[PDB]
Write a protein that binds this DNA or RNA. Structure first.
Ligand SMILES: [Zn+2]
Ligand SMILES: [Zn+2]
Ligand SMILES: [Zn+2]
Ligand SMILES: [Zn+2]
Ligand SMILES: [Zn+2]
Ligand SMILES: [Zn+2]
Ligand SMILES: [Zn+2]
Ligand SMILES: [Zn+2]
Lengths: 7, 312, 300, 7
DNA sequence: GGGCGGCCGCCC
DNA sequence: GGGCGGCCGCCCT
């Protein structure tokens, strides 16, 4: 569930 | 004045140069490191330099960088249109434009630009954010000439790398610039055509700061000894084990990722000659490779003597 | 020794360390020409130049005497005589004086809380130079050795420095831990006492400014910052005063109507023609003001 | 651009 | 009789 | 998952 933060 | 506190929602730069949403659990003022818990409930130590406070709701009235007032005129407090964080113009790298002034009204900070542009396998090549990325990459958010490197120039104690100034491991998806000898994350570059293999230093690379513009990269020619060593190390890292079966793991990996390997002169090689050349390479170099035969296993098993990347 | 092209850390007049490259050395006058990141070049004294080693960098020698084991720092890896260091090193993790400051110092005041804040405070109890043997000018503003503050680096008294009322030494803003607001240039309206004379934390008291003082300090601060002489009252002088009114620490003048602020300030600018020059003297608008002499406001 | 050196 | 090339698999 | 525990089954005699 860990993933890069994206705007 | 305080910038980081316990229970604070936070963005953390990882060794891949990517930002992950987390929460600070403990603040170690002595080490300047915080214990961050991420979405997968995993806890890690992250340096303060790689920690940015999450986007608060609404406007921010204090510079998120220095957390103090300035008495120097012409140093306005500008807000990023994305994360709504406030910056002193001189507290940003590069210097942030005042509202209006330089023509686009809406200014986006370095953190958000990287957050939008960076991507595993290489960042954006085209678009407004690719060009915004390029603009930011011409300036480093740290002092490069002051880093404290080891003898091999593989790691520095400040743990500052790339254009992002984040942490990183040279042997894990990072290219070294031929000019400044600095290592740069795969996700932060914009010049690659294929995803980097773990430990693949078979490149000639020059970063944006040295070039003063777009990056320049060239794929060096691999020997068959290199391909065997590179595939082994990549698998050794990716699968986290030592010994690999030739016919059911090593070979099926190469043929299924042959184009991604960028083998150049060897790219023509017929499938049958692939096996014979790889097998002979794996057998002929006992200084690099160890057969399963050495530890009472089948002879088609291979691993690396030391889990090290291929030398160049 | 030192050579050309060598990358070094140089202690600037603000007490902070900046990374630079040596362009020329002069052993005759013990000075060094250093180029910095912004491609600027300045003459730096060798006392401010900083270059798994075995030698003591302070005394240029090895010793026999027991009790003072040559201890190396954890950050800069330099070897220190236990008694050539100030105040004095534990023998064996140890961080030397210069690195403690490097970690703790900051523009607008050093760290107040934390392990390094307490570390520097322990360091600030003693000076790494002979204070009594310093040569001062008549105004006691400058050194011949250019040694100031707790750090022992260079500095200009009028550029964000405070003078101790007891020992009269000048101290960098970045090396103090007592300030609540950033220093304006040329601000001497303080009663300051260092850590050495106090044997503990610094003590500082803000003096009460008059209106002529406010006008002079603001005009001088703007003059240093903007590098020009004449400032518009309504477009520059008053907005700055209003935007940074809280940081000025003006005591009783704080509770003054902004309408009267403008009047009191404009009145002082027109009255004191020994300090200020209106725009009349250079055929501009009278609301323009500049200092007669580019000098900090004097204390009564 | 000049940057104060910390370790 | 039993030496030895060879490598299948448990086990924490 | 890899370091050994375990030992089949050729060969020579
Ligand atoms: Zn700021
Ligand atoms: Zn932003
Ligand atoms: Zn470079
Ligand atoms: Zn990066
Ligand atoms: Zn100082
Ligand atoms: Zn040190
Ligand atoms: Zn010594
Ligand atoms: Zn004193």
């Amino acid at each position: 569930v860990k993933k890069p933060h994206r705007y | 004045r305080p910038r980081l506190w316990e229970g604070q929602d936070v963005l953390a730069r990882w060794t891949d140069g990517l930002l992950y949403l987390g929460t600070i659990k403990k603040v170690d003022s002595a080490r300047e490191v915080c214990l961050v818990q991420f979405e997968d409930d995993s806890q890690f130590l992250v340096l303060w330099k790689d920690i940015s406070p999450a986007a608060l709701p609404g406007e921010e009235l204090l510079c998120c960088v220095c957390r103090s007032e300035t008495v120097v005129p012409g140093n306005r407090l500008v807000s990023c249109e994305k994360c709504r964080h406030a910056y002193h113009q001189d507290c940003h790298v590069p210097r942030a434009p005042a509202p209006g002034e330089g023509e686009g009204a809406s200014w986006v900070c370095r953190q958000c630009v990287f957050a939008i542009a960076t991507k595993r396998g290489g960042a954006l090549k085209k678009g407004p954010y690719a060009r915004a990325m390029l603009g930011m990459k011409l300036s480093l958010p740290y002092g490069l000439k002051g880093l404290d490197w080891d003898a091999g120039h593989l790691s520095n104690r400040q743990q500052s790398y790339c254009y992002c100034g984040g942490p990183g491991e040279w042997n894990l998806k990072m290219l070294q610039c031929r000019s400044c000898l600095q290592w740069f994350h795969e996700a932060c570059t914009q010049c690659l055509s294929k995803p980097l293999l773990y430990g693949d230093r078979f490149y000639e690379f020059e970063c944006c700061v040295c070039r003063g513009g777009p990056e320049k990269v060239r794929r060096l020619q691999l020997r068959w000894v290199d391909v065997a060593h590179l595939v082994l190390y990549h698998l050794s890292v990716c699968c986290k084990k030592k010994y690999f079966d030739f016919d059911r793991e090593i070979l099926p990996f190469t043929s299924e990722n042959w184009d991604s390997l960028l083998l150049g002169e060897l790219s023509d090689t017929p499938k049958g000659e692939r096996s014979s050349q790889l097998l002979s390479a794996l057998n002929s170099h006992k200084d690099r490779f160890i057969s399963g035969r050495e530890i009472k296993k089948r002879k088609c098993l291979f691993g690396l003597h030391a889990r090290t990347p291929p030398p160049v």
